[PDB]
Amino acid sequence: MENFQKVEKIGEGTYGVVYKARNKLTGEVVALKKIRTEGVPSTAIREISLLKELNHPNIVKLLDVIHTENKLYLVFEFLHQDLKKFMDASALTGIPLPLIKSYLFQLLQGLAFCHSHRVLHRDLKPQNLLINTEGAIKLADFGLARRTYTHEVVTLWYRAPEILLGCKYYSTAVDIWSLGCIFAEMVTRRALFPGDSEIDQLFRIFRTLGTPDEVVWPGVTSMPDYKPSFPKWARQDFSKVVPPLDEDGRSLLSQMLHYDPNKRISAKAALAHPFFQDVTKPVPHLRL
Numbered sequence: 001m002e003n004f005q006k007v008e009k010i011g012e013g014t015y016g017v018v019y020k021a022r023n024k025l026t027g028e029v030v031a032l033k034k035i036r037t038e039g040v041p042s043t044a045i046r047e048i049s050l051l052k053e054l055n056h057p058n059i060v061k062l063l064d065v066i067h068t069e070n071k072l073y074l075v076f077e078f079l080h081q082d083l084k085k086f087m088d089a090s091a092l093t094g095i096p097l098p099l100i101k102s103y104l105f106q107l108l109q110g111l112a113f114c115h116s117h118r119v120l121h122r123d124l125k126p127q128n129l130l131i132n133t134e135g136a137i138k139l140a141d142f143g144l145a146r147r148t149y150t151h152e153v154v155t156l157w158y159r160a161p162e163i164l165l166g167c168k169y170y171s172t173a174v175d176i177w178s179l180g181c182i183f184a185e186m187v188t189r190r191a192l193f194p195g196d197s198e199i200d201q202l203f204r205i206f207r208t209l210g211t212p213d214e215v216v217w218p219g220v221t222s223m224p225d226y227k228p229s230f231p232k233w234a235r236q237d238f239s240k241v242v243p244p245l246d247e248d249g250r251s252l253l254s255q256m257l258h259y260d261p262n263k264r265i266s267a268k269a270a271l272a273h274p275f276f277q278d279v280t281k282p283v284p285h286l287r288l
């Protein structure tokens with residue numbers, strides 16, 4: 001961008017590269033996502049427009065969308081750290097439960113909002129959850145229905161089982177699943193389902209929650225990628241999953257990880273779960 005002074009590369013997003021940049025005129029500091037191109041979509045244009053109007057305290061603000069010279073630029077409000085870095089920085093001591101609870105609660109408010117506006121994120125993971133010094137956490141890098149590019153590896157750790165099983169239409173339930181996996185990770189300081197391939201991801205989920213069947217997930221054996229040959233693992237005692245999370249937290253997590261997308265708790269209902277009876281908004285200790 002001629003109007004932007006790149007300060008540094010933040011990373012390789014999911015479609016292109018992300019830079020911390022300064023509006024050479026206004027002096028505003030922003031995150032700039034640069035994408036690709038041989039025609040560009042139109043169905044996406046509508047998706048981008050809605051995302052731009054989708055303003056909420058727990059959703060990173062999309063400031064501008066600039067399509068020029070076969071490149072697409074998305075300008076977002078800048079936040080100083082992502083949750084992946086914060087979790088790594090807190091791995092020795094662990095993120096205090098009140099902060100874990102505050103973050104989960106804020107992310108559920110963000111999801112309740114996008115979901116009520118029929119917007120799905122589709123790819124929640126620690127790297128796309130951004131935090132600030134004021135204790136806020138926000139959803140970033142929403143994925144469209146429509147890895148950066150070459151030499152990359154997509155993280156499958158937070159993928160819902162119905163996606164892995166070939167479901168063609170995602171429901172808002174896929175975001176609840178990803179967030180449940182993130183909640184578990186903040187608590188235990190270890191990824192819940194660290195698969196290195198789609199089948200390894202699926203089988204790690206099965207080994208922990210039990211291989212799904214028609215009793216717990218009606219219709220699962222008729223799904224596109226389901227095979228009768230899948231191994232049959234018994235569900236593991238849940239208390240072994242996220243120690244030492246309290247029963248309120250474990251109850252909420254179990255509801256966020258129900259196999260059946262229709263049984264999985266909604267963001268709205270999760271906000272009313274007993275786990276949040278004592279929620280507060282603590283200040284995180286951020287080293288920037």
Ligand SMILES: Cc1ccccc1C(=O)c1sc(Nc2ccc(S(N)(=O)=O)cc2)nc1N
Pocket residue numbers: 010013014018031032033060076077078079080081082083085086127128130140141
């Ligand atoms: C466009 C995009 C793609 C993927 C993920 C997020 C975004 C995004 O909107 C970002 S990224 C960021 N800053 C930041 C600062 C520091 C760190 S870090 N590793 O923790 O040093 C990470 C992110 N701010 C915004 N708005």
